[PDB]
Amino acid sequence: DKIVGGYTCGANTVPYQVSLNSGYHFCGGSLINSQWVVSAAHCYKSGIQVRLGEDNINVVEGNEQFISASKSIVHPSYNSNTLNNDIMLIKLKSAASLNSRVASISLPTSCASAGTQCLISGWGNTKSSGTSYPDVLKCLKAPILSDSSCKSAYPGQITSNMFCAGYLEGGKDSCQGDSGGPVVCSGKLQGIVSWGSGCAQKNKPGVYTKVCNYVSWIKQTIASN
Amino acid sequence: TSPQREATCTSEVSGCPKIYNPVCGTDGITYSNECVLCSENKKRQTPVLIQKSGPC
Ligand SMILES: [Ca+2]
Numbered sequence A: 001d002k003i004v005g006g007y008t009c010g011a012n013t014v015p016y017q018v019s020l021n022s023g024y025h026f027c028g029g030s031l032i033n034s035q036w037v038v039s040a041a042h043c044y045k046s047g048i049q050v051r052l053g054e055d056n057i058n059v060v061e062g063n064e065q066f067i068s069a070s071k072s073i074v075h076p077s078y079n080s081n082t083l084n085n086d087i088m089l090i091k092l093k094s095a096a097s098l099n100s101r102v103a104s105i106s107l108p109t110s111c112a113s114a115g116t117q118c119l120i121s122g123w124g125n126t127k128s129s130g131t132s133y134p135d136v137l138k139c140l141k142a143p144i145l146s147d148s149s150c151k152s153a154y155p156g157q158i159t160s161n162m163f164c165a166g167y168l169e170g171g172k173d174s175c176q177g178d179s180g181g182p183v184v185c186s187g188k189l190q191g192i193v194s195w196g197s198g199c200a201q202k203n204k205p206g207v208y209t210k211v212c213n214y215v216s217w218i219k220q221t222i223a224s225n
Numbered sequence B: 001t002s003p004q005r006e007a008t009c010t011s012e013v014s015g016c017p018k019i020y021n022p023v024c025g026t027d028g029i030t031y032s033n034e035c036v037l038c039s040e041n042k043k044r045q046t047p048v049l050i051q052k053s054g055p056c
Helices: A147-153 A215-223 B034-042
Strands: A017-021 A025-033 A036-039 A049-052 A065-074 A088-092 A117-127 A131-143 A162-165 A182-185 A188-196 A206-210 B023-025 B050-053
Touching: A017 A117, A025 A049, A025 A117, A025 A188, A025 A215, A036 A188, A088 A215, A117 A188, A147 A162, A162 A188, B023 B034
Parallel strands: none
Antiparallel strands: A017 A025, A017 A049, A025 A036, A036 A088, A049 A065, A065 A088, A117 A131, A117 A182, A162 A206, A182 A188, A188 A206, B023 B050
16 A cells, blocks of 8 residues: 555554654664663664654654653674664663653563564555555565575575565565564564665565564663663 | 756665655656665666755
8 A cells, every 4th residue: 555565553563663854754663671672784874863763754643752862872793784784772861751652671581484474564555556655654564584595586685684574575565664563473573674675565575673682782782771 | 867966875875765865856756865865776777866955
């Protein structure tokens, strides 16, 4: 659809979802505790405002939290040319006040296998003439693909820190404005929305940063900052 | 063409990042990011340039 094959969902359903705002919504993120957010490294900008408890990013419904980012820490081996290690930490200036629309997502203990179904969320929408923009909060269930089939879709491009999720027939995907947001598999954060060849195209599934490779880096980075 | 800024797109992947960082084509289309305008161009025999940053 206009929601890239997904379904609409609310901030109660995905309370760990956040918006990154620099005058407009450019990326998503996930809340991993009261003060910290995980996003994609290519989402790095200066002067990010984090918006939590959002149902509509265009309308202030009186139940959202707007918190400035105090610190943004991009993985030290992030390569913008290959998108490898596409993961960033954001420290909020103050702690979020946690409630039904605002809560944090657990980090994985093990990696997810092929065929595990996950939930991908974000504000990425697509208009008619294939033109993508943020608006409605949408959700999508998608499987994790085998590494074979992912490398077969993007030959030479897939590193050990990426996985593919989605449907080889297309129609359902994440798209521009979804970058940095959550892929949650059985209550754990297993992915971050990273890249793809277009959106919801046949034989071109979305490509996500594999968060299980990073759990120690994340935990030690948070703890020393 | 009625120009004034190319897209500088040096990606080593055959895909674009899913960030919303719009640019206004000289054609009058809003491209959700510069990488998208790039990939769109490469299947064109006449490149659209960037009229302004932000949506048209
Ligand atoms: Ca709102």
